[PDB]
Design a protein around this ligand. Structure first.
Ligand code: BCB
Ligand code: BCB
Ligand code: BCB
Ligand SMILES: C/C=C1/c2cc3[nH]c4c(c3C)C(=O)[C@H](C(=O)OC)c4c3nc(cc4[nH]c(cc(n2)[C@@H]1C)c(C(C)=O)c4C)[C@@H](C)[C@@H]3CCC(=O)OC/C=C(/C)CCC[C@H](C)CCC[C@H](C)CCCC(C)C
Ligand SMILES: C/C=C1/c2cc3[nH]c4c(c3C)C(=O)[C@H](C(=O)OC)c4c3nc(cc4[nH]c(cc(n2)[C@@H]1C)c(C(C)=O)c4C)[C@@H](C)[C@@H]3CCC(=O)OC/C=C(\C)CCC[C@H](C)CCC[C@H](C)CCCC(C)C
Ligand SMILES: CC(C)=CCC/C(C)=C/CC/C(C)=C/CC/C(C)=C/CC/C(C)=C/CC/C(C)=C/CC/C(C)=C/CC1=C(C)C(=O)c2ccccc2C1=O
Ligand code: HEC
Ligand code: HEC
Ligand code: HEC
Ligand code: HEC
Ligand SMILES: CC(C)=CCC/C(C)=C/C=C/C(C)=C/C=C/C(C)=C/C=C\C=C(C)\C=C\C=C(/C)CC/C=C(/C)CCCC(C)C
Ligand SMILES: CCCCCCCCCCCC[N+](C)(C)[O-]
Ligand SMILES: CCCCCCCCCCCC[N+](C)(C)[O-]
Ligand SMILES: CCCCCCCCCCCC[N+](C)(C)[O-]
Ligand SMILES: [Fe+3]
Lengths: 258, 323, 332, 273
């Protein structure tokens, strides 16, 4: 006789094999793949006209809503209805369903393609204890550059075309994580300030190189509402602007490299 | 290129933050200090450390286990300090070599091993309490503790649950560098090749997937660091372009996608499943399967191959052969 | 640290299974030259005159040889066993029939043992056979023997370190490791498996599910038997200068048929032959040896796979003297 | 068809070859030129697998095995049934993998994001080349490569390991295994942490970046930070194969004995011998 034998050529290990697959597919299909759908759902078709009743699969693929209690007041529930309101300055290059769109205007200002920003809250990101998280050093006076590292304040900013475009006046720091996220710079010849994500900055000891945009394009970087704080949507607008330059700053950057 | 994803170009310093917990705020010891080279690839602040009761209990029991092991190891080189350093990797504390069943073994043949096993287990439980309660003290979910629980459960499986289910302490994992390695082959040989254990397969599938997921997830976040994708908590509660681009990269690549939150559930689940599958495998081994290869043959799964050099009959089964 | 390419590789299983030998040419060449020192056969002599049973006074094993045949043997024995010492190693200069020196009596038993090998163990030595040279390699003490505890160095022609010396207890783990191809396995495969026939090498169950009545508690073999078998296999592999796939398809170490090479069967016979040699020919000779030959337990030196093979899958790369010295076996 | 936020990203451009000719989607899938080459190679490889499998003994998926040639064919072409199909399928695999990587860089460019993901995907393509191309080149036969079969490739991993008596003592393997283990552990920690902050339970409020770092400082005295854990995770995972490849390439070409014996460089220093 055998430990683990059952009647008619079954054994326990054989059953557990089936059970294990059942557990896996249950968690993956009925749990994880629905969690995956708490954003961007329900999907968008060539006009979903049936306003009278929902299609069955759209209800089945969604999880029950969850509510986040925000740390400084408010609640967010996902999933939820969030259509993109703003007019997009794009035109269909063809009649095909998945043909690409073309920018009709200037895609950096129009904020399309890689220049697109998400419609986040017009809200300032906050520290544990309520202060503004992302602040320039003139405000965050107990924060310093670490000894060892370039102080960029005073250095010029060189754009993709090699032209000096402005001068770094300040660093914005994340007070929650102790990490610099933007440089502030005056754009020469325009009597205004612009913010730059550090990730677009090549910090050299005599200059800040910036390959994403041209010098002239520093004029139309999204401006902030206030001088000394930034909203989450503004952070998106600013970051997106330079990323759009990777594909759009010159006509040649959108075409094939070969 | 985004040099920020490689290292921090300009580091920042500021006053050290302390988030208060429901208890134990005074048991944080040490003064924080800063490392400039650490700060290139990470956060520059080292310390302070919380120092609760469970953490000290862990250190207490752990050191006891370590000391029992080191002493037995030194006995193995008759306390010669020079041979001890030379042979360190080859030294070990072994479970019983003789079959006592489940009876408590003599100290010279497995008793000290059992002892070191007890104190390590207490050390793991104590640290688990630390991992759990620190989360509730700071008002956080207990997700880490439940993953850590699976990892502790797997150790108990190979350390003592499987021995007690088959009824012999001789099957535990030895303590020591090479000797805990040697156990893996002895065990796999005993139970008919672990490649043919489906739960080995599952565990490996999930372990490899942890590499796939963390490479893919880490690469994704770095690829969207310019839009702040590293600030994941606020990207969960207020979807930004970072996670829109991350989601669309994968959707356009493989045809579907996760959310910034759900990708962490995937990762957490895959990690957990490495240890859960391993434990089911050990729990079945010896108790309900004796030879995993023959079990796969029984169920028609094993591959077969032509002979290359001639097939060879077991000589022990020829007539007149010696024993 | 490393060995420069190229490597010589062979195939021992179906394509795609990664079975076969991996050999470093330099190393093979050095072993080929060491083994080529095998002295060539002495010239054949005409069988003439009466059997030496009628001519000499104390000839118990080689009695059916003629005088020239027999003295040819004695020349070959001296070349193989004691070339530097000469005939006087075993003999009194003035009385060639005197057994007063212990090498004489031992050599007589070695003659019987050697013909036993070539007659009763053809399942292992085939038509290649052994001579005294196979083990002794030109010295009375063979360079590769084993005691009831591990000794270093493996070649007793080299001088031991203080730590290598068997009486230095702090060096035991290293003495053991070097016998098991540098593994940390805590088992001495020689005294466990090759000194006698008391232990079973196989440990793997031959059924899918555990059989009730052999599978719980003290009914079970301890896991240590599996460590020990593994240690025997490390040691065996190192003794033949080869790896596991020379004999096993590691898909199922316990299966024969297509899962094992013919060398695995020959190896199986080798285990039985070594047991016979140690139990019945070599271990009893502690009565006839000086105390400086015995180990710390009064045991004589005994044989393992390395004694004959010395790191080569065939001893002396298959060299044979069987046809040149019929008197060493096989015997009708 | 489209996620609620997707349309504004679905713009022209970013390709590496062909410009507009392949710049479009099919359902959710971006195509591009490497989309096309990928499907080509996938279709070819899967055809060859099917043709080869039918000339074989069985259809049980666990037992099908397309194997490389005997060692005696060296680095040459082998007859289709006895190694040739393996050779053909291998080339399709490399075509498919590289196409897949290059397709991901195009998708990356269109979205204006970093190329980190295809970069990371190079590591497993590299490891595949170590096993199937580079190490067989160094030894002189395609026969040393591994066979394509669910269970058969494990028999090759198995025997390959035992060709060096105990593979666990391979120092490149030891390094590789350590990264596999710590990577799986870190991913649990990272995922666990994020979930614990966003989902405290009980209607309690979601916590903060500072809570994240406070937790790990409290438990282990250090916290690498949000951005850094993602860099570390890519580093950890990548080094499973980056360090492992040395232990693989070494075995055979640069080491022919057992791997335990290799540690004699340490054990046999005369100073303490
Ligand atoms: C040097 C050592 C290696 C190794 C050692 C190894 C071991 C020891 C074990 C496996 C196992 C596995 N390996 Mg294997 N392996 C595999 C694929 C596999 C799967 C059958 C399985 C689980 C993989 C997994 O979940 O990863 C994580 C990836 C995930 C989770 C994403 C899903 C991938 C999907 C499950 C893979 C399915 C692939 C298809 C079966 C094959 C493609 C078919 C074609 C026609 C479309 C591929 C595709 C390759 C290639 C191309 O190199 C590979 C190379 C290797 N494996 C090397 C030879 N592998 C396990 C098994 O159970 O095998 C029976 C197992 O125990
Ligand atoms: C020849 C023998 C082999 C073997 C023998 C083997 C055995 C016997 C077992 C495995 C197991 C496993 N094997 Mg396998 N194996 C694996 C991979 C794996 C793992 C995925 C899996 C789980 C082990 C683990 O993650 O522990 C890493 C994590 C651990 C150990 C948890 C530790 C947590 C703990 C809380 C840490 C705390 C420590 C303290 C801080 C320190 C205190 C210490 C002091 C006090 C002394 C691969 C990828 C391959 C390949 C490529 O061939 C392979 C081949 C082999 N394995 C051969 C077949 N393997 C396990 C399994 O899944 O079986 C079904 C298992 O039991
Ligand atoms: C008896 C033999 C053993 C052995 C023999 C062994 C060998 C011979 C080798 C390893 C290797 C490795 N072993 Mg080891 N091993 C390992 C772990 C590991 C891995 C970490 C490492 C790398 C595996 C690899 O190369 O994947 C390869 C995976 C690849 C190439 C992925 C390719 C993916 C591809 C790019 C895309 C595939 C696409 C699909 C086809 C598409 C289909 C998708 C579908 C869904 C549409 C553990 C954790 C253990 C334990 C617990 O004991 C263990 C024991 C053993 N190993 C036994 C001792 N192992 C390797 C190593 O690094 O050694 C230093 C190695 O060469
Ligand atoms: C798939 C699931 C994976 C997984 C998961 C998880 N694993 C976790 C958690 C999860 C979720 C935790 O929450 C917990 C933790 O806390 O993480 C920060 C933890 C652990 N997993 C450790 C080791 C490990 N995981 C392994 C494997 C897997 N795990 C598998 C792969 C392996 C292998 C592969 O062998 C090893 C060796 C320890 C670091 C830790 C316990 C320490 C202890 O139990 O105390 C024991 C008591 C002692 C005195 C030991 C002292 C030394 C250690 C290194 C502790 C020193 C810390 C100290 C703070 C140093 C001070 C520095 C300061 C001065 C600057
Ligand atoms: C340390 C680095 C880690 C790492 C990293 C990353 N991994 C990535 C990325 C990164 C960054 C991606 O960006 C990419 C992806 O998009 O994610 C969804 C990807 C992917 N990782 C896959 C598999 C995978 N990753 C593994 C391991 C690691 N990954 C390690 C751990 C392992 C194992 C065995 O461990 C597997 C099986 C696919 C799912 C996917 C490629 C799809 C493809 O390539 O499409 C193209 C090809 C096909 C759709 C099929 C082609 C069929 C060929 C022609 C015919 C079959 C031949 C084949 C050889 C036969 C084999 C038989 C078999 C039984 C032996
Ligand atoms: C027919 C035809 C002509 C088609 C033309 C178009 C074309 C080229 C089609 C391709 C068809 C093919 C080959 C499809 C196969 C697709 C493939 C390879 C699917 C593999 C899927 C597998 C098994 C993935 C394993 C990894 C895994 C478990 C992922 C689950 C979780 C996900 C979705 C992770 C990806 C993911 C990660 C890693 C994030 O970090 C992240 C961060 C923030 C938001 C989202 C994400 C996110 O989605
Ligand atoms: C030990 C390995 C020996 C060496 C070297 C030599 N001889 Fe020997 N011899 C040995 C034994 C064990 C025996 C007994 C043989 C038997 O069948 O029982 C012998 C015998 C002889 C004889 C016959 C002597 C007699 O009984 O009258 C002779 C003449 C003889 N041996 C000569 C001889 C010579 C010339 C040697 C050097 C060339 C020589 N022997 C070496 C053991 C050993
Ligand atoms: C391996 C299977 C052997 C073969 C074949 C022969 N001998 Fe041997 N011999 C062997 C061992 C393991 C030992 C013990 C170690 C020792 O030195 O005793 C011996 C011993 C001898 C001796 C005694 C030598 C001494 O102790 O100084 C002699 C004289 C001797 N052997 C001779 C001898 C002859 C003549 C052989 C062929 C007929 C022969 N041996 C074969 C191992 C093996
Ligand atoms: C040939 C010269 C061999 C080499 C090299 C290796 N093995 Fe072996 N093994 C061999 C034989 C003849 C036997 C049978 C022993 C008997 O007395 O019946 C074995 C046995 C095993 C076993 C046990 C299998 C069982 O039935 O329980 C195992 C697990 C084993 N061998 C493993 C093994 C490994 C890992 C090796 C390389 C290190 C190895 N063997 C080499 C013959 C030969
Ligand atoms: C001398 C008495 C021997 C001892 C002790 C062992 N072996 Fe042996 N072996 C010996 C001979 C003379 C031969 C013949 C060589 C030939 O050309 O046939 C062999 C052969 C083998 C083989 C065959 C190898 C091959 O390539 O075919 C194997 C696998 C083998 N021997 C293994 C082996 C083992 C494991 C031993 C210890 C138990 C062992 N041999 C002892 C002589 C002697
Ligand atoms: C009722 C009572 C009597 C019986 C039950 C007791 C009980 C619960 C026993 C349980 C025993 C268990 C769980 C045993 C498990 C043991 C295992 C898995 C051991 C595994 C590996 C051990 C290793 C690698 C130890 C190596 C030891 C050393 C290197 C010496 C110690 C020194 C160190 C610095 C430790 C460093 C370890 C590592 C971080 C490098
Ligand atoms: C099995 C582990 C037993 C370890 C016992 C020692 C741990 C003490 C736990 C104290 C926890 C106190 N608390 C809940 C306020 O954190
Ligand atoms: C990595 C090991 C994987 C081996 C997989 C073998 C699973 C066999 C399960 C067989 C299912 C039962 N049945 C009836 C179909 O034979
Ligand atoms: C061996 C471990 C098995 C791991 C299985 C995980 C596979 C993920 C499957 C994704 C399925 C995708 N989709 C869209 C069909 O749901
Ligand atoms: Fe993350």
């Amino acid at each position: 006789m055998y430990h683990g034998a059952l009647a008619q050529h079954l054994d326990i290990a054989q059953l557990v094999w089936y059970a294990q697959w059942l557990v896996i597919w249950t968690v993956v299909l009925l749990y994880l793949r629905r969690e995956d759908r708490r954003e961007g759902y329900p999907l968008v078709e060539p006009l979903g006209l049936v306003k009278l009743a929902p299609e069955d699969g759209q209800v089945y693929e969604l999880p029950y809503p969850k509510t986040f209690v925000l740390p400084h007041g408010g609640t967010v529930t996902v999933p939820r209805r969030r259509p993109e309101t703003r007019e997009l300055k794009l035109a269909q290059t063809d009649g095909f369903e998945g043909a690409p769109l073309q920018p009709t205007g200037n895609p950096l200002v129009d904020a399309v393609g890689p220049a697109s920003y998400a419609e986040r809250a017009e809200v300032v990101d906050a520290t544990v204890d309520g202060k503004a998280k992302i602040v320039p050093l003139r405000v965050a006076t107990d924060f310093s550059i670490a000894e060892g590292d370039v102080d960029p304040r005073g250095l010029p900013v060189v754009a993709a075309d090699g032209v000096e475009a402005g001068t770094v006046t300040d660093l914005w720091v994340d007070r929650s994580e102790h990490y610099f996220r933007y440089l502030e710079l005056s754009v020469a010849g325009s009597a205004r300030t612009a913010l730059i994500p550090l990730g677009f900055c090549d910090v050299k000891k005599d200059k800040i190189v910036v390959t994403s945009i041209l010098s002239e394009q520093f004029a139309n970087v999204p401006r902030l509402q206030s001088r000394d704080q930034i909203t989450l949507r503004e952070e998106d607008k600013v970051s997106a602007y330079y990323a759009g330059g990777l594909l759009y700053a010159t006509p040649e950057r959108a075409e094939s490299l070969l | 290129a985004d040099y920020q994803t490689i290292y921090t170009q300009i580091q920042a310093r500021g006053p050290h933050i302390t988030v208060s917990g429901e208890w134990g705020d005074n048991d944080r010891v040490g003064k924080p200090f800063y490392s400039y080279w650490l700060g290139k690839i990470g956060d520059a602040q080292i310390g302070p450390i919380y120092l609760g009761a469970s953490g000290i209990a862990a250190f207490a029991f752990g050191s006891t286990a370590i000391l029992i092991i080191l002493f037995n190891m030194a006995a193995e080189v008759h306390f010669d300090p020079l041979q001890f350093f030379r042979q360190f990797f080859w030294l070990g504390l072994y479970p019983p070599k003789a079959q006592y069943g489940m009876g408590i073994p003599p100290l010279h043949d497995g008793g000290w091993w059992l002892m070191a096993g007890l104190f390590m287990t207490l050390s793991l439980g104590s640290w688990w309490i630390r991992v759990y309660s620190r989360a509730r003290a700071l008002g956080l979910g207990t997700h880490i503790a439940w993953n850590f629980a699976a990892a502790i459960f797997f150790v108990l499986c190979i350390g003592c649950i499987h021995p007690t289910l088959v009824g012999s302490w001789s099957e535990g994992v030895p303590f020591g560098i090479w000797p805990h390695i040697d156990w893996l082959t002895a065990f796999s040989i005993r139970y008919g090749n672990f490649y043919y254990c489906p739960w080995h397969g599952f565990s490996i599938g999930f372990a490899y997937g942890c590499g796939l997921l963390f490479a893919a997830h880490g690469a994704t976040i770095l690829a969207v660091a310019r839009f702040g994708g590293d600030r994941e908590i606020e990207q969960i509660t207020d979807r930004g372009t970072a996670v829109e681009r991350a989601a669309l990269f994968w959707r356009w690549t493989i045809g579907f996608n996760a959310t910034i939150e759900s990708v962490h559930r995937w990762g957490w689940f895959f990690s957990l499943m490495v240890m859960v599958s391993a434990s089911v495998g050990i729990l079945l081994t010896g108790t309900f399967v004796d030879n995993w290869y023959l079990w796969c043959v029984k169920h028609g799964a094993a591959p077969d191959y032509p002979a290359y050099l001639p097939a060879t009959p077991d000589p022990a089964s020829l007539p007149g052969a010696p024993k | 640290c490393f060995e420069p390419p190229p490597a010589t590789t062979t195939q021992t299983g179906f394509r795609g299974l990664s079975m076969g030998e991996v050999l470093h040419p330099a190393t093979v060449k050095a072993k080929k030259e060491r083994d080529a020192q095998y002295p060539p056969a002495l010239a054949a002599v005409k069988a003439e005159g009466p059997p030496v049973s009628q001519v000499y006074k104390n000839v118990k094993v080689l009695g059916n040889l003629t005088e020239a045949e027999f003295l040819r043997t004695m020349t070959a024995i001296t070349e193989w066993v004691s070339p530097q010492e000469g005939c006087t190693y075993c003999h009194d200069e003035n009385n060639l029939a005197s057994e007063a020196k212990y090498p004489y009596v031992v050599a007589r038993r070695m003659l019987e043992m050697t013909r036993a090998i070539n007659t009763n163990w053809t399942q292992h030595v085939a038509q290649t056979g052994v001579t005294c040279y196979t083990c002794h390699r030109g010295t009375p003490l063979p360079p590769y023997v084993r005691y009831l505890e591990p000794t270093l160095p493996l070649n007793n022609r080299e001088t031991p370190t203080h730590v290598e010396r068997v009486e230095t207890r702090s060096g035991y783990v290293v003495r053991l490791a070097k016998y098991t191809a540098y593994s940390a396995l805590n088992y001495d495969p020689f005294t466990m498996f090759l000194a006698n026939d008391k232990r079973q090498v196989r440990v793997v169950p031959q059924t899918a599910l555990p059989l009730v009545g052999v599978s719980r508690g003290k009914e079970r073999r301890p896991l240590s038997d599996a460590y020990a078998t593994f240690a025997l296999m490390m040691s065996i592999s190192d003794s033949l200068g080869t790896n596991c796939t020379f004999c096993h398809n590691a898909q199922t170490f316990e299966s024969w048929g297509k899962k094992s090479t013919p060398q695995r069967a020959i190896a199986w016979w080798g285990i039985r032959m070594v047991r016979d040699l140690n139990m019945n020919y070599l271990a009893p000779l502690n009565a006839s040896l000086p105390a400086s030959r015995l180990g710390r337990q009064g045991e004589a030196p005994q044989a393992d796979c390395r004694t004959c093979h010395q790191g080569v899958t065939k001893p002396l790369f298959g060299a044979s003297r069987l046809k040149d010295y019929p008197e060493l076996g096989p015997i009708k | 068809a489209l996620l609620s936020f997707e349309r504004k990203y679905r713009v022209r451009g970013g390709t590496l070859i062909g410009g507009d000719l392949f710049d479009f989607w099919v359902g959710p899938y971006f195509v591009g030129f490497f989309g096309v080459s990928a499907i080509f190679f996938i279709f070819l490889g899967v055809s060859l697998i099917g043709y080869a499998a039918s000339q074989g003994p069985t259809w049980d998926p666990f037992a099908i095995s397309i194997n490389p040639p005997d060692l005696k064919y060296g680095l040459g072409a082998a007859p289709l049934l006895e190694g040739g199909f393996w050779q053909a399928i291998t080339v399709c695999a490399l075509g498919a993998f590289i196409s897949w990587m290059l397709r991901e860089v195009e998708i990356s460019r269109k979205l204006g994001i970093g190329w980190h993901v295809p970069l990371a995907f190079c590591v497993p393509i590299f490891m595949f080349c170590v096993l199937q191309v580079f190490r067989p080149l160094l030894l002189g036969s395609w026969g040393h490569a591994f066979p394509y079969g669910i269970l058969s490739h494990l028999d090759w991993v198995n025997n390959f390991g035992y060709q060096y008596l105990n593979w666990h003592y391979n120092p490149g393997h030891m390094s590789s295994v350590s990264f596999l283990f710590v990577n799986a552990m870190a991913l649990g920690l990272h995922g666990g942490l994020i979930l614990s902050v966003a989902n405290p339970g009980d209607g309690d409020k979601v916590k903060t970046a500072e809570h994240e770092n406070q937790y790990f400082r409290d438990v282990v005295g250090y916290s690498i930070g949000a951005l850094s854990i993602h860099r570390l995770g890519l580093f950890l995972a990548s080094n499973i194969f980056l360090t492992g490849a040395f232990g693989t390439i070494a075995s055979g070409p640069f080491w022919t004995r057992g791997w335990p014996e290799w540690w004699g460089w340490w054990l046999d220093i005369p100073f303490w011998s």
